[PDB]
Design a protein around this ligand. Structure first.
Ligand SMILES: CCC(CC)N1CCN(C(=O)c2cc(Cn3c(=O)[nH]c(=O)c4ccccc43)ccc2F)CC1=O
Length: 350
């Protein structure tokens, strides 16, 4: 029977729940009868990535729209869906390709979690919570609610909830201090880079067994670079509600998980519109998507030598931008050092 703190036990139970994995796939309208969770495979997901890349190439290189029709149907054969009586969305425009790329990103970490679960060694004299905790290769400690860490983090949550994201209120349930094995050594070449910032990264709960196991990762080479607004990198935000929207919580599942990561941004290539890149020009270390609203810079606080942009939202004065709020993208996984994991309750306004 596990000795782990009860909040950590609840976390392990949440991120390894198999039925949550199936619910996520059903939410995507994937046919569970034809393609069960156990038949989901990494090379199958990579093959689906390549079809999206084929669609990307066929659209831009001026091929037949007829081929694009066939590539779309091939995607729905490779990944069986079940839209009941409705017509499955056609894969012929960037809008549809980006939605399927997002779906494959989620399937990729679901496969990592399920394979983690069904692998390794097993011992019936051990609590499955203890076994699954050790499979994450991550030290997880509860942050004291009255500590100054929690104070700064709660202030960060309190001040950076955008007015536009008015559908819900956020309530911090647990603050976890996490150390992924090996990630600190991997981050060492970037530890002294300038412009280090503590930024948010939200994701579906079904992704976090893979995120704690493997870290935040760049989409595989088969993934289409045009499937993501700023290409294939790791995305962060400085508004907690922007990243909280990527938790994709609902009134049925109102508990979300959000990361605080130390990100070495260096020289930021500042952009106002989409730019589908996989690498940066020499002398640039990150992309900053310029939003119309930014945390007030005069209110930046230092936490363990890292900037925390917890200022309240003010106009950035940035002219023509497709972004309401800022985005930060790095294109090297060694530029990220995950520090905290928050468990939030979404209180939806009605
Ligand atoms: C988790 C599965 C794996 C699969 C390899 N994965 C997926 C890709 N990825 C990203 O960071 C990533 C995220 C978004 C969307 N987005 C988000 O989801 N949360 C945020 O807070 C956020 C904040 C600002 C902007 C976008 C955000 C788009 C493109 C990306 F590349 C790293 C990663 O590891």
């Amino acid at each position: 029977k596990s000795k782990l703190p009860k909040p950590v036990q609840d976390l392990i139970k949440m991120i390894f729940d198999v039925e949550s994995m199936k619910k996520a796939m059903v939410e995507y309208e994937i046919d569970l009868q034809k393609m069960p969770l156990g038949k989901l495979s990494k090379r199958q997901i990579q093959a689906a990535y390549s079809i999206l890349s084929e669609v990307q190439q066929a659209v831009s290189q001026g091929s037949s729209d007829s081929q694009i029709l066939d590539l779309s149907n091939r995607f729905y054969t490779l990944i069986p869906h079940d839209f009941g009586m409705k017509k499955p969305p056609l894969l012929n425009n960037a809008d549809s390709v980006q939605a399927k790329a997002e779906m494959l990103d989620n399937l990729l970490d679901i496969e990592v979690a399920y394979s983690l679960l069904r692998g390794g060694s097993d011992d019936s004299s051990k609590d499955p919570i203890d076994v699954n905790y050790e499979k994450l290769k991550t030290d997880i400690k509860v942050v004291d609610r009255d500590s100054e860490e929690a104070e700064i983090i709660r202030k960060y949550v309190k001040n950076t909830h955008a007015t536009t994201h008015n559908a819900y209120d956020l309530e911090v349930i647990d603050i976890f201090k996490i150390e992924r094995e090996g990630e600190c050594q991997r981050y060492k070449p970037f530890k002294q880079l300038h412009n280090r910032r503590l930024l948010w990264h939200g994701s579906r709960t079904t992704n976090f067994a893979g995120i704690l196991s493997q870290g935040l990762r760049i989409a595989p080479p088969e993934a289409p670079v045009t499937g993501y607004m700023f290409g294939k990198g790791i995305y962060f935000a400085d508004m907690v509600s922007k990243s909280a929207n990527y938790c994709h919580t609902s009134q049925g599942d109102p508990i979300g998980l959000i990361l605080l990561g130390e990100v070495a941004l260096g020289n930021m290539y500042e952009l106002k519109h989409a730019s589908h890149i996989s690498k940066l020009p020499k002398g640039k270390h990150s992309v900053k998507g310029l939003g119309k609203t930014t945390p007030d810079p005069s209110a930046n606080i230092s936490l363990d030598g890292v900037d925390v942009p917890l200022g309240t939202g003010i106009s950035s004065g940035v002219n023509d931008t497709s972004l309401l709020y800022n985005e930060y993208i790095v294109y090297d996984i060694a530029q990220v050092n995950l520090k905290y994991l928050l468990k939030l309750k979404f209180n939806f306004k009605t």
